[PDB]
Amino acid sequence: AIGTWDCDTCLVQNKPEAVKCVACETPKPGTGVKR
Numbered sequence: 042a043i044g045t046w047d048c049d050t051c052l053v054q055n056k057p058e059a060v061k062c063v064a065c066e067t068p069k070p071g072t073g074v075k076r
């Protein structure tokens with residue numbers, strides 16, 4: 042797993058340290074592959 046993900050619900054990127062997006066606090070689903 043890369044360990045990094047971007048939030049497309051509000052165009053905001055989050056780093057591995059993040060947990061819940063600041064603008065909308067995304068659940069941060071755990072997915073091995075983004076695609």
Ligand SMILES: [Zn+2]
Pocket residue numbers: 048049050051052053062063064065066067
């Ligand atoms: Zn977001």
